[PDB]
Amino acid sequence: STMDWEVERAELQARIAMLQGERKGQENLKKDLVRRIKMLEMALKQERA
Amino acid sequence: MDWEVERAELQARIAMLQGERKGQENLKKDLVRRIKMLEMALKQERA
């Protein structure tokens, strides 16, 4: 029957889903961190002037 | 056959995603360190 394959395929897809979820979380966090750095740079410059 | 092909493509996908984790985590560490030092710099200047 197709059961063994459906079970295997679901486990693979789940591992992919977890990896893709982690990556997406990291990508979004990275983009937010970049904005924070830019704004700190501007605050530092303004504070210095 | 059609399972063997999908199996191979799903497995390649997991492999390439696994190999990219350390680089993502390196970059995160990079950016968090930049923020830490900038926050110190700002505090010290405001003090």
Side-chain angles (χ1 to χ4, degrees), chain A residues 5 8-9 22-23, chain B residues 3 6-7 13 21 46:
Chain A
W5 166 244
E8 188 189 352
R9 186 188 188 270
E22 172 172 37
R23 176 177 64 172
Chain B
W3 295 343
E6 183 174 24
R7 179 170 334 208
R13 181 85 193 173
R21 300 163 114 273
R46 284 175 176 175

Side-chain angles (χ1 to χ4, degrees), chain A residues 31-45, chain B residues 35 38:
Chain A
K31 287 171 174 157
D32 295 349
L33 293 181
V34 160
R35 295 192 284 112
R36 191 179 190 100
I37 289 168
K38 296 289 197 186
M39 296 310 310
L40 282 166
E41 285 174 345
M42 183 171 281
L44 182 55
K45 170 189 180 180
Chain B
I35 295 166
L38 273 166

